[PDB]
Symmetry: D2
Subunit: 287 residues, 4 copies
């Protein structure tokens, strides 16, 4: 208990091979992930926007993300990695973002080298800031962060500038104070061993679906020197399909009978929540 | 539309036979429901608590619910019914709840006759306030609410006091100013026609799964005099199963291949969000 | 009976029309808004600098929509008095601006002001301000007007006088009105003789910002009205007095081990109860405890 | 000033090293900064302040979120240990637990929770209703069961005016037994009550020196001599702030200009000093001198 969220995350990176980090859009999903046995969870920036019905276009601000993060960390001590896009503004905003995330009991954040009006890392038409501007971002963050807290610098540079230039950026970023590196949308697993060796610090691979990356296995990615594997939206995408199906079912058939087999049971829900321990205490109070 | 949220809800109750109201835990789910063609949506109190990882035991307050409601109404004008439990406190809290819900562009709320430390309406061991205390609650709410805004009084009395006593309560509640009635956990469809006739105002039936009620159809419930049918957690329950499955898959197999067929596609997601209209405008700005 | 059936935007437009000129006073919180209402002001203001400073942050565009929105909601919950809200430069691009407008409307806000500075903005009476070109500001205004209701008031603010001079500032303001701005906020005009020419050229109602310790002399409402100004803003006046008073109480308690010396400078419990209508509530509470 | 210490620890240390510890109310972060600048060692978020600032009466309408939001804003701006009013705990055992956990997460140093019924009122008003000793012990158990060690739970008793000194001491003692760290002796009307109260309860005692209530305003020294360890000034600054604000508004209304108010305003430069504004705007000009 008395270990800091940052420390828990660093320890999960070290002891797992590799550490699988799964996205959760809300506290209950975080609980499901914990129950399944994952050692780290993730708050997706795109998830934050999409869940509000907004596109992933840097419309959201620190408060949209912070509120979602707080809800999660209130429900579980499982170390949480939070997407903070490009830091929500200049040096002062970045400092605020870091301080606030720490205050919200967050374990780690990732900040990237795109320009302000950012987009999904697997989409075309991304624009990057120069190495210097990103170093500035990193300095603002490290200047105010605690030791244990993990800053993951994310580079979106591979698809635009190629492997060599990307490694250069990552190395400068580590130099500037980044703890770990998020190598976004490396298209070939053979890139990783050379990337991981050059940057030295733990590297995260983003195994998102419907992107520019093939879906490799955790084992494969570990063998190529990767320390963290991210599943940013996987559960959310399944959740949406399931929800739509229930709605269609209710609309078409005037009843949800057909959906019942696809629903988690009341008892399983109670299990995840520890509901019975609470209602029992409530009946003892009522007598 | 230039019609108020309350009016939109009243109109949906009148024009549909019956009005199906589906639960949504977040704005995106509300969008899915809208796309499918529902005329009204619902914010479940249990949903609000459970999503935060809390039991449905009246731990949540006005702010927990209000925040979830605001997020939804920001994304859709589809009239929203919001669960406000027992009103979160005394007369003044109830007044605040009503005012705040109106300010959040909510169409209707439901408030129930349980004691403060409330529970799911399909669980055993429920305790009710007397008829007088509930009338007090209703007065506090009606005293500050606009005309169009819909106050649904919910009675949890059937399982404890039986149908006759429940109808009595509901009738007093309508008298005190309730617009509509939420008849919680009526176990038999033959109860409804007598209930609906006695209370006169539109009645909501709660078709929740894994409770004390059989799952009747909308048509059946309409034939028995019911005007609204609620599906409070249906989508949420499916969402949770789907999510757990993805997590298990990723854990066991080190990859999500097996899950792919069970995922909504990027393009369908973009469709629901209108994503393309935004990213196109973004490319036109970068070309200038 | 106007408070009841009229939209916040409409209430603000009506206050601008019926007053000569409309004095708009800053309030940092709901209680201050109530004090202003009690004194008889027809419109109130949420200062962006106030929002930041009250959190202990500098007025340097660090704050986001949520910082301002939360403060605004608290105020509009307590009073129907039309509220003007400072939204800086709109908190981001076209989509953020749209969100800001929609959210402010949802928060029962009457009007906002958005300005032509660059993202990392500063106080309008400080040196070293940087502006976006006319085109970029028109873009901002379009994003806002495209989503706003009719009644809701968009005040375009130009910070251009100190940088580009009166002529260039009038040009900007006129383009801004053309792009859909309802009213104009002429920031930090140094001389009262600037106003009549400014007001005539832009046609729409003009706000003059009578902030202390700035680049403007403190003219009177009457004077500013005579020079064609329709709104006069007192953005931080109360806040500045509040801070001095608070510091003094703290010093007093520190030095003397008791607050005796401060008592004469405190609003009384009874005056507080009056502003809140406290008695009406506690009376109803005793009647509820008596039947139970 | 070094921050490897938990907020609870900082508060306990301030109680021990000061004689007595003056705790001043601040309604917002900026006020907290003013208090810090003046040299106070602990600050306070008033529940009545939270309600009143929203334009609501102090009648238990506010919930955990109203208070939590105000507390977060303060603790973001200063490490100065903050004592937060949590009324009666906002609900049952589970709500209390949530309140405690959330307050800790918000970097709060200490809370005070009282023995009134749910629909509570100002402790210096007539017509207060208390829960029995058992119900309050329940409240305290719910809180202590989830709180960290360093975090300070101050049990407040509102019982003096209703049940008298002896019954109040009994309550306080049971409360300490149930796990309370410190005691808030609300609205003792006479300074001669304190030495007997403080001796009986043993744990540090807070005296509430609020104006326009049922208590005379004694000095810190006096209260210390009578065995009191903390002295609270819950609304003092707020009351002065309100008067000052009203006066500015009257001035602007009557005279069409704020000239008469200028002498009563903190200067731009003093404001900049409290905020460290110049350090930020200077860095901003150095950044603009490349582009
Ligand atoms: Cl926990
Ligand atoms: Cl919408
Ligand atoms: Cl009001
Ligand atoms: Cl700090
Ligand atoms: Mg992202
Ligand atoms: Mg419910
Ligand atoms: Mg401003
Ligand atoms: Mg209090």
């Amino acid at each position: 208990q008395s270990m800091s969220p940052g420390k828990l995350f660093r320890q999960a990176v070290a002891n797992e091979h590799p550490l699988q980090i799964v996205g959760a859009i809300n506290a209950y999903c975080a609980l499901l992930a914990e129950n399944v046995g994952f050692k780290a969870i993730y708050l997706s920036g795109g998830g934050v926007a999409n869940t509000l019905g907004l596109p992933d276009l840097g419309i959201t601000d620190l408060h949209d993300v912070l509120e979602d993060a707080r809800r999660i960390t209130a429900a579980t001590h499982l170390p949480l990695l939070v997407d903070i896009d490009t830091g929500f503004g200049g040096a002062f905003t970045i400092a605020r973002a870091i301080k606030e995330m720490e205050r919200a009991q967050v374990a780690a954040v990732h900040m990237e080298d795109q320009v302000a009006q950012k987009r999904c890392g697997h989409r075309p038409g991304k624009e990057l800031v120069n190495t210097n501007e990103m170093v500035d971002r990193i300095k603002a963050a490290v200047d105010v962060k605690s030791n244990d807290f993990v800053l993951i610098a994310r580079t979106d540079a591979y698809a635009v500038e190629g492997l060599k230039a990307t490694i250069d950026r990552a190395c400068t970023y580590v130099e500037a104070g980044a703890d770990m590196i998020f190598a976004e949308a490396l298209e070939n697993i053979n890139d990783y061993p050379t990337f991981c060796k050059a940057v030295k610090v733990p590297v995260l691979a983003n195994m998102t679906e419907f992107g520019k990356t093939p879906l490799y296995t955790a084992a494969q990615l570990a063998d190529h020197g990767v320390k963290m594997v991210l599943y940013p939206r996987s559960a959310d995408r399944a959740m949406s399909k399931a929800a739509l199906a229930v709605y269609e079912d209710i609309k078409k058939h005037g009843v949800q009978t057909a959906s019942l087999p696809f629903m988690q049971t009341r008892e399983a829900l109670y299990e995840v929540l520890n509901y019975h321990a609470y209602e029992d205490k409530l009946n003892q109070l009522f007598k």
